[PDB]
Amino acid sequence: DIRALKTLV
């Protein structure tokens, strides 16, 4: 879930 700044998945 938390990595960098998610947009599409």
Side-chain angles (χ1 to χ4, degrees):
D1 291 275
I2 199 285
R3 193 285 189 177
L5 197 290
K6 204 291 308 296
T7 190
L8 63 288
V9 281

mmCIF file of all heavy atoms in Angstrom:
data_model
loop_
_atom_site.group_PDB
_atom_site.id
_atom_site.type_symbol
_atom_site.label_atom_id
_atom_site.label_comp_id
_atom_site.label_asym_id
_atom_site.label_seq_id
_atom_site.Cartn_x
_atom_site.Cartn_y
_atom_site.Cartn_z
ATOM 1 N N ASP A 1 0.845 -1.220 0.000
ATOM 2 C CA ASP A 1 0.000 0.000 0.000
ATOM 3 C C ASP A 1 0.885 1.278 0.000
ATOM 4 O O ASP A 1 0.903 1.993 -1.006
ATOM 5 C CB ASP A 1 -1.063 -0.020 1.134
ATOM 6 C CG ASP A 1 -2.178 -1.063 0.967
ATOM 7 O OD1 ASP A 1 -3.176 -0.775 0.270
ATOM 8 O OD2 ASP A 1 -2.060 -2.173 1.532
ATOM 9 N N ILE A 2 1.612 1.565 1.104
ATOM 10 C CA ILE A 2 2.489 2.767 1.225
ATOM 11 C C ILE A 2 3.881 2.462 0.585
ATOM 12 O O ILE A 2 4.596 1.555 1.025
ATOM 13 C CB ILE A 2 2.511 3.281 2.712
ATOM 14 C CG1 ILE A 2 2.987 4.754 2.889
ATOM 15 C CG2 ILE A 2 3.157 2.335 3.758
ATOM 16 C CD1 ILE A 2 4.487 5.069 2.746
ATOM 17 N N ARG A 3 4.233 3.227 -0.463
ATOM 18 C CA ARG A 3 5.527 3.084 -1.185
ATOM 19 C C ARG A 3 6.074 4.511 -1.476
ATOM 20 O O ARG A 3 7.027 4.926 -0.809
ATOM 21 C CB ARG A 3 5.362 2.120 -2.397
ATOM 22 C CG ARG A 3 6.655 1.601 -3.070
ATOM 23 C CD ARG A 3 7.388 2.620 -3.965
ATOM 24 N NE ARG A 3 8.485 1.980 -4.730
ATOM 25 C CZ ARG A 3 9.248 2.618 -5.639
ATOM 26 N NH1 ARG A 3 9.121 3.908 -5.946
ATOM 27 N NH2 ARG A 3 10.178 1.921 -6.266
ATOM 28 N N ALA A 4 5.497 5.249 -2.451
ATOM 29 C CA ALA A 4 5.930 6.628 -2.798
ATOM 30 C C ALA A 4 4.655 7.514 -2.861
ATOM 31 O O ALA A 4 4.268 8.058 -1.822
ATOM 32 C CB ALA A 4 6.842 6.607 -4.045
ATOM 33 N N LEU A 5 4.006 7.665 -4.037
ATOM 34 C CA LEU A 5 2.749 8.452 -4.174
ATOM 35 C C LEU A 5 1.904 7.756 -5.279
ATOM 36 O O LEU A 5 1.992 8.085 -6.467
ATOM 37 C CB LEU A 5 3.045 9.967 -4.413
ATOM 38 C CG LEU A 5 1.905 11.001 -4.179
ATOM 39 C CD1 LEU A 5 0.766 10.932 -5.215
ATOM 40 C CD2 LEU A 5 1.344 10.985 -2.741
ATOM 41 N N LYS A 6 1.104 6.762 -4.847
ATOM 42 C CA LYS A 6 0.210 5.940 -5.708
ATOM 43 C C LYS A 6 -0.838 6.766 -6.516
ATOM 44 O O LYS A 6 -1.473 7.669 -5.957
ATOM 45 C CB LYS A 6 -0.463 4.909 -4.750
ATOM 46 C CG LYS A 6 -0.997 3.590 -5.353
ATOM 47 C CD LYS A 6 -2.221 3.641 -6.290
ATOM 48 C CE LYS A 6 -3.496 4.363 -5.803
ATOM 49 N NZ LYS A 6 -4.124 3.716 -4.636
ATOM 50 N N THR A 7 -1.016 6.440 -7.814
ATOM 51 C CA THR A 7 -2.011 7.115 -8.697
ATOM 52 C C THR A 7 -3.073 6.148 -9.322
ATOM 53 O O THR A 7 -4.262 6.408 -9.116
ATOM 54 C CB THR A 7 -1.337 8.110 -9.692
ATOM 55 O OG1 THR A 7 -2.342 8.885 -10.340
ATOM 56 C CG2 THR A 7 -0.428 7.513 -10.778
ATOM 57 N N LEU A 8 -2.702 5.068 -10.055
ATOM 58 C CA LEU A 8 -3.690 4.181 -10.755
ATOM 59 C C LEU A 8 -4.151 2.851 -10.078
ATOM 60 O O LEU A 8 -5.329 2.515 -10.236
ATOM 61 C CB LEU A 8 -3.387 4.045 -12.283
ATOM 62 C CG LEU A 8 -2.093 3.404 -12.868
ATOM 63 C CD1 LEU A 8 -0.825 4.260 -12.701
ATOM 64 C CD2 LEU A 8 -1.832 1.954 -12.433
ATOM 65 N N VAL A 9 -3.302 2.090 -9.353
ATOM 66 C CA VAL A 9 -3.707 0.788 -8.727
ATOM 67 C C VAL A 9 -4.472 1.010 -7.390
ATOM 68 O O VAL A 9 -5.630 1.483 -7.442
ATOM 69 C CB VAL A 9 -2.535 -0.262 -8.650
ATOM 70 C CG1 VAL A 9 -2.276 -0.980 -9.992
ATOM 71 C CG2 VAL A 9 -1.198 0.258 -8.067
#
